Amino acid sequence: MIIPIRCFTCGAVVADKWEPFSNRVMGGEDPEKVLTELGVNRYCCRRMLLSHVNIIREIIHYTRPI
Amino acid sequence: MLDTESRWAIAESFFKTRGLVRQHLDSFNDFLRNKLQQVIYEQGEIVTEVPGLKIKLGKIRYEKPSIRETDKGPMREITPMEARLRNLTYSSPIFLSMIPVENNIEGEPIEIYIGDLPIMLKSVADPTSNLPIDKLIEIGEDPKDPG
Amino acid sequence: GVVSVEDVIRRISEQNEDVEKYMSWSKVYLNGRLLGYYEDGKELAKKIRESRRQGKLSDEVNVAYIATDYLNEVHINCDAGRVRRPLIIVNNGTPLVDTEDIKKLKNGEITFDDLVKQGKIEFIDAEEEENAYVALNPQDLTPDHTHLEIWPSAILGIIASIIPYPEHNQSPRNTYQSAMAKQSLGLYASNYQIRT
Amino acid sequence: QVMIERLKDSTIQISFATVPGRIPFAIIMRALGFVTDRDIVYAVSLDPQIQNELLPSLEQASSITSAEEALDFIGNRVAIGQKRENRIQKAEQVIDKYFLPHLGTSPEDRKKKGYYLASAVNKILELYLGRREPDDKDHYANKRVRLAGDLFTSLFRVAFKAFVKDLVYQLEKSKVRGRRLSLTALVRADIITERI
Amino acid sequence: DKLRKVAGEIATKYLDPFNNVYIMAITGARGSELNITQMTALLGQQSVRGERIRRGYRERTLSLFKYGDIAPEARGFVKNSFMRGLSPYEMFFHAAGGREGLVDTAVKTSQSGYMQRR
Amino acid sequence: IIMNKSSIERGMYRSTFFRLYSTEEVKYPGGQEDKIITPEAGVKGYKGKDYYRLLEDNGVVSPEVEVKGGDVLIGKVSPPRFAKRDTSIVTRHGENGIVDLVLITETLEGNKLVKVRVRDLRIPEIGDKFATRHGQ
Amino acid sequence: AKYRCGKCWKELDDDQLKTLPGVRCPYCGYRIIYMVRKPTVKIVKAI
Amino acid sequence: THKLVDIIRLNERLKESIEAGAPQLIIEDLWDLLQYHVATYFDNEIPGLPPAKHRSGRP
Amino acid sequence: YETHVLDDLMEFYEGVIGYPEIDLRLAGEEAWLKGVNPELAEAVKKIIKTIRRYLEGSPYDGSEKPIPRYIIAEIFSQIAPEVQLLVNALDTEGKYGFLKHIKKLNLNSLAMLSKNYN
């Protein structure tokens, strides 16, 4: 839905790296180099950044009135 | 010699033009376009015990989905989300144009409301089938549901 | 050119004709009802198939020719409910779909419906597939082959295509995966908050 | 459902739901419009070897020479205790509307239905002679899948039949009593709306 | 059957003397020789109700094969192990072979319960 | 299987379960007889004054409140079919959660329809069932 | 007992003191209303 | 309870027929109906006899 | 002529005639009544509706086997108010003598040969 604050395996913050990684990958750069120079070398964090859906962008339209 | 990508192009085109649930939509569209009038025609005519009186069934038609808010309301149209929230039935009215025969005279044809039929989602009957993504978001429907 | 059964019986009875002349003929059935007789089943089946492919006949008609040594018949089906699958038509060992068609598909000029209308890909039922000879891959294609598969891994369903490398598992494992993948938790709809 | 059986003796017995007991093959053929055994034999098939198995059935129906003998033989089973004319009429309605209605319920189509029946008998003989194996109930050439269309149109058919029944009742009551001629107030639409 | 047994023996001989899967199999810790053969050498003949795969079109178990073909590959014989991966028709035949247990267990439970109650 | 509890504490497989309780203020033949939705004071079948603590004035519980055990969510009183009786909704005894959403509508026939959706947070624990994409 | 008109997302607000036939908001004819979050502080422990 | 009240009231009807000088055959028919109601009260599902059904049609 | 319909009911009650025969005779007499009086026609329609509801798809269905006595008694119980109304419509000394004593009996449970399914 929204990117987790910390990697599930190791308590490393990956939430702040979502915007740069996503913006640069969408810009036309291979995810490997972007991840390597962003500061995530353990593949436990890479699977956190690589396999994310960002459902929260769609949900804000369908929000409970409450 | 079609490689993997060439054949996957055909498969992706199949899944793109034809939805995941196509058998239901195809059967319901066949029913609405043909079988609705076919049932009326196989019925043929309404004949009563009295000889002079007769009824001929001319044509059948379905309107856009709507509900009767009041006793004699104008049948305002609704969205499937409203039907879900208010426990309504997403159904459309049926008008059958039957002409009355009294003393063996045809008279003038009249179409009457014979009932509401539930319609399949994302079919020819409902308007949400051809709506754009933004309109689907605005009405309150998930853009990805196959119906 | 199908001669009606009553016409055949009349022209054997009313007119003196050879019964063995019509014994070697091929019976022609339509939707399980004996429709008539024909000279040879293969020619009529090919005529019906070509008429359907050219667009003259409807695409819902499926024709098959049995040609058992004891009995030969032609079965024509046009009723609803038949589960039919699309196959690429292969003529003389080369599929009808070509490089230009694939380029148009990739560009988006034509779609799958345009392919089936053009006669390149046809939907066949079990009865018609009885006399079809299919190849999994273009490298397996021979002049004897009649059809080709659009997607070799399309024999699976929606859930059996979820599994990665499913051919390395045992079949009960894949069946149980299909059974228990419907129970998994996740986002069932983007508008789950307004829905009740 | 119509069931055709071959007993230990080569006689063939045809039965269906409303008629108790088993009707002989040649009797029901003569009731449908066939006049002499030659037409029945040639309608079943054209091969003498397979035609020779109908003789015991024909001579079991040898006493039945005309169509009316077959008709009242059936009518004895259909309903017993009424006059011969009533028996003939009852047999006529049950044969027309309860035998093979997919071919047609009108008396004009009756002859056609007879031909169909003969073809069915042919298959049994082809099964008995050893020419063909029994049909597979699992083969998809024999299995059809009904989606929402066929079911939902059957449901609309029954709902419309009930609606027309109620409309006829109300219209006849209004006519014998004397009321408004307009159909708008006699619609009673919910008969469909709720039913579906 | 002899071919499958020979292939299993060859795979076991060429296999490492002491593997984790081998340790599991030989010690009796959730393993068997047939499992080793099917995971390494080849699946073997897949039989439904004790006989080769016969159901399908006339004289064909599948539309991929020629009319009246009695070759081993045609009627439910898989020459590919699970490590190598199964061909589409091989996977179909494996599924057809394994279909039976899913219902045999269910019927067996009720029959055994009834007999034990008696 | 063994699962890392630190991952669970970081939201590895935390989930939410939503349950819906809905009623219709149905009108049945009589003189202006309706099952008005209102908090209950002294009528028969009364559950107890403690169970109506969180029920709002209009008779339906306000969103974002803790619901424990058999708390009432919608207060409904029904006249007898053959003198008020309690048909008010009691939250399931086992289920505990927070009220997520409250919805009020008018049905086609003109009866008041009220829906209350209650959410419950499920953190993975010992005994929870997990499965891979292969049948394990 | 404040409410909210369900048209679009969180369309304005309603008060129970407003009296209309059936259930409607005065602003629009939409038939669906929702109860708002009560103006009280809620303690939510972060597990 | 429903079967019992049916039996009781039908027995009352049979008594009224007996005391009113009714024809013999209608008395025998009512007697047969009473015996059927009793034989349904015990072992409703008996072969050769239609089970009594409630107003909703359930057995 | 209500004499014919009452004699028809007497004949049906004696069991000499089956269900389709009595249905046909009541249909003809209902046509006659609709010609004469619509109220008699609707009474006969109710009587045949009750008879068909009970005697639909019966094991005999007009066969030589007689109708069981309890079925006849029960159906004549259910149609008793309509029979009394028909007798009140036209009074016949000989015919109404047998129907003067038959009364309506309300039953919670009914022996309907036909069910909801058919």
Ligand SMILES: [Zn+2]
């Ligand atoms: Zn990490």
Ligand SMILES: [Zn+2]
């Ligand atoms: Zn508003």
